[PDB]
Symmetry: D2
Subunit: 389 residues, 4 copies
């Protein structure tokens, strides 16, 4: 159980780049980071419009003199103060993640970087080498992985409760972009611009979420080959896809399927992962994150509930209220952010034992997300043929 007791001596001194007044994702970063004394928001470069960034920073309780016009000034000016930031969350559009993360790491700061890490695998490999050389934590906000029942699924699979794993069926298929909403909505507009978004739309934007859930649940699984067929149903998005099918062969013969979509008309979110074994399946759906289907062949189907005593102990650690009270995605994000804070603090203290026991989406998860999108785009561009992973 969590009761708000501190996990580190003092909150990590913290800034955001992006996540400004009109952003989609800025708020959940702060909601999760400020919770339970993990981080303190003392500075930021909140907006591309520096005037609006400072107006908003002040409404967030930030010193107007620590609302900087850009990330370079933020890092340089904060470095001069003994109470300067120790960590920065990057919530800008995708095109700036590489440059901002690189600069933060070279400035000796820990980073939480919005997915994706960057556009290309070569950039991802460079970022990872710079993070490791500078001994910095890089969290990546695969936020759904914060839900307790993802750890339950991992533990059940590891204990052989599904038998031998045969298939991993993943989807993130919503309908919000069935129409060309780019015309009116700035957040969608930049996501269908290859200059600002990169080589893919839905593969990178939504496909990588349930992919990361499969990596938490099946940590030893390795993709041998994949093929990807992708479409721009809203023709103006071409070459960026608003729908894709990724079929994968894992080492050992298991199969993987990822359906990525922003044109699944009527779907509110539709992020699901079903892991199918020789004995049993489990299935999780992000819109109802407090339940996990557990279906042993030839037995009654079961539903596992967040907070119940029959769960693996790893799956009960982060309960903030008793079973039957619904937790949501803010709890999942809070569960990642306190781990980010413990990892950053542990790094500063040289607490190697604590570091090694902490599990969170990190630089390595970020690299794999970029690798997968790049291989999918390579297959799709060659007309949906099998490629070596």
């Amino acid at each position: 159980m969590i009761n708000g007791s501190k996990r580190i001596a003092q909150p990590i001194r913290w800034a955001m780049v992006g996540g400004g007044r009109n952003s989609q994702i800025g708020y959940i970063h702060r909601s999760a980071a400020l919770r339970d004394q993990s981080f303190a928001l003392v500075a930021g470069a909140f907006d591309i419009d520096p005037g609006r960034g400072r107006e908003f920073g002040v409404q967030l309780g930030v010193d107007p003199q620590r609302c900087y016009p850009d990330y370079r000034t933020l890092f340089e000016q904060e470095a001069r103060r003994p109470d300067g930031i120790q960590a920065v969350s990057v919530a800008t559009p995708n095109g700036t993640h590489f440059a901002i993360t690189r600069a933060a790491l070279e400035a000796g700061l820990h980073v939480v970087c919005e997915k994706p890490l960057c556009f290309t695998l070569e950039e991802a490999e460079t970022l990872r080498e710079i993070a490791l050389a500078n001994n910095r934590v890089v969290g990546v906000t695969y936020g759904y992985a914060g839900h307790q029942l993802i750890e339950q699924a991992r533990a059940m699979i590891a204990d052989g409760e599904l038998g031998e794993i045969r298939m991993v069926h993943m989807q993130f298929a919503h309908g919000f972009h069935s129409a060309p909403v780019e015309g009116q909505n700035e957040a969608t507009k930049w996501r269908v611009d290859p200059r600002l978004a990169g080589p893919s739309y839905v593969l990178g934007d939504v496909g990588t979420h349930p992919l990361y859930l499969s990596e938490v649940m099946l940590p030893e699984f390795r993709i041998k080959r994949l093929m990807c067929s992708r479409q721009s149903f809203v023709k103006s998005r071409a070459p960026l896809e608003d729908n894709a099918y990724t079929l994968m062969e894992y080492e050992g013969g298991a199969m993987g399927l990822v359906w990525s979509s922003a044109v699944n008309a009527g779907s509110m979110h539709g992020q699901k992962i079903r892991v199918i074994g020789s004995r049993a399946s489990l299935e999780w759906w992000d819109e109802h994150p407090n339940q996990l289907a557990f279906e042993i062949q030839g037995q009654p189907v079961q539903v596992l509930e967040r907070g119940m005593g029959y769960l693996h102990p790893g799956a009960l650690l982060d309960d903030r209220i008793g079973a039957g009270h619904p937790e949501g995605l803010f709890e999942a994000w809070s569960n990642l952010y306190y781990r980010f804070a413990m990892a950053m603090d542990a790094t500063e203290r040289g607490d190697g034992a604590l570091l090694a026991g902490l599990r969170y989406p990190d630089i390595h998860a970020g690299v794999e997300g970029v690798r997968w999108v790049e291989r999918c785009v390579q297959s799709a561009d060659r007309g949906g043929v099998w490629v070596d992973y």
Copy 2:
């Protein structure tokens, strides 16, 4: 509404080949055929064990002298009687469908043939030419197509309620063969024998069901290309697949996906079809056949119910009881079988107007089912590459 009033002057004089005492499917054929004065069971070759076939025929109320040891004797002996059969249902294992259907057609009998029609497209084309030359009806028991809400979905799509069709997502993924049950179960045993079952297991056995539903809903849709990746997770079934992924490109750019499986551990049936348009999606699930999800992007999701006045008139014709009372797969099969009887009777009477207005799974549907399986096996055998359809 249906109230049991006759649709033809007299029940079609009818026989079964197969569907004996220990069969899985024999009973639903009779339940549907005998309902509402459609067919009268007057003869049969019910079993590979002729003694057990006659024992069972007598318990079905059939004259023991009209319980014949084989289909050839059935057709020859019945031809001698003025009250001889006019039609025969073929519910034998897959390997005998071609020979029995061919003999029945050449004997001037109407046929209801269990899916699949036969193993090869060349056999299917031959059967169809013989059915047409002899002016015989061949029904095919794509039984799920008898559910009223399949016609509702067809009518909604035709009226543009989904907008332009983008994707057709189909699955028939159950878990009953997660373990090697072939060891104890004769019905599964013959299905994993290529000599008796043919070139595929789950593609032919279950994949063709939701494929046929898509052909009812999207009658003008044409597959341009497909690829199929198939697996034998129970290794002893090789080369017959217990799992398969079929990805299809339709003419006009829409995509199709079929997941066929007998190893989806914990799944009771899992036959679903989701049609996704630019405006809205619909989705139907065979285990809850009296509801149809209708999901307009940006509006509340809706559930359409069997028997309600807001349905298209085609979708209300076959209601046997008021909305809210659950109908099941026996009603769906009864809805096909009365149409089979009307078509057979209309053929005898030369009632061309009635024939042209009747919609049922016919010889042409049977040919397409065989074509699709054959193309999938061709792609799968070449390592899951795109093939022209």
Copy 3:
């Protein structure tokens, strides 16, 4: 499993009174009765309009000379023929059930009587004495009790799987009469006329269905006291109720609740029964009759599926197709009607051993349904006070 093999040597020679061309319930009687060689429809008094009754009888394949204008002529004329009826189903409006059932019993016929048996407990007691004196079977069409999982629930309760029973929560709450549809619909019109319907509307029409399910599941349970508060929300129905709450105390301290409604706007049927024990609950919903919720406190909830090997053997006897294929209310009614036929045939043969092992809704169930409605009306009329049962 059922495979259509005869259960009695010859079909019971059978008539209907009512169930004519425009009736709601006539068809499901015939669908269930004619199935599997149980009954043969050889005569009827189908309609209050004798011309329309004969037109319809002929379309049902009945000899026009055995389409009689009334039940008295039916019984008198059939008595003269060696192939005369042996049994009659009564599907007339409620007001005529007593007179028609009494006449059939005095004529030495077995009866299947539509619920309710009659208006008053004194009439019910008289009917029962006449049925017993004449050694006749009286089936009552509590059709939902034919669903296999009702027997599963009975068996689980009897084996202590719920622990000590604490509460029985019952509802049959649909919305079809939220508006005054009596204006246009003859079936609703007679149900809100006390002269033709009797002392209650929804208590008798729908409340008695889940009440009977509780009597199957908890056969030793006895109601000690009840109170009933009833409303006419469509004011013109007064004094007949379109909504009611019945609260009951059982002997031993368990509580019962029945919500009866025709004004639950938006509800398609809403017949549910939840039995709550010290250890676990089970819950069944008529619109999804092939599943049974089984919820052990402190364990994952389970869903039990029709046709699965983990069910009690009593619950597998009536399976007509494999698990995962949806059966519906026609199967439930067919399961009662073959038992009615076996009981009638067993009575004629003096097969006391078979009779004693048969379980079906009978004269005694019919009497209890009338008793419960009468006590509820007595409480409601006294302003919803506790009455001795």
Copy 4:
């Protein structure tokens, strides 16, 4: 939308009484209060064990010298400091709510009081008079009322979308106390002690939650009469009930039903409210708080989703993330707590216009909760008879 911008100039200086290290509810108070700069936790009397209260306060970041041994010392010592508390949340067991709230109000502090306000209506009336005389805000943590779709339901009802309201069906029926867990669990133990808990267990503990939801949705509705039948199924709890049925007549003829239970074996929470009108019903379930069923008679059922543009504007104000991302009970509590802070700040500033537009569970809601429990206990003690409300 909420983006974390301040709603008042400075966070309310805040304390808790109770909500200590081992409490069930202490954490959600702090999670909601500290969010978005609403309150600052600067002091507390956290625990009956003052040593453990101070240990925990320090882990919450509170000055050890402002971790006081009791509420009287907290109020007296804080009054001496210019940075003293302005408001206090009371999260002690029920028996101390009256004395602590009274003392806080007399000390000129705003209060958030855990439900229930107190044991007796006479105490409730006294507390309310003292709150009003001292011009203090008293929030009451009917936390479920913070869910956006409760406001959607209120707005739909007010706009006549349900037609005339006929029934209000409420339940809070969980199974966690099916067994005598009081033996091992201190939180359950005090709830079944009349000295510490008061005159009821489940009526007060859970029944009052969906009752308050009905008061938000139907603000002009007035209970004319009610009856209550209550049971102690775990006999040792007598006279405190672990199950109850409350039937109510509203002025104007609508009916209300509340099922309160801690012995609904297998239920994870089971808090539901269904409002049934002449035209349509709506239904909300606390375990899936982001959906609202909307069921127009004779139309397809609909599901309304949190965050969608078709919602009433009142129902979109508190969205913290886009539609399809699940919010939970922490958001609901955060939505109450920021309103509590705005009301307290508005009271200090004399901003009468802002005060009058704020809607939150207040002193008046607290009084009604106590009134309802007291009337239910009065009816139950007289053997479940109608009492004037």
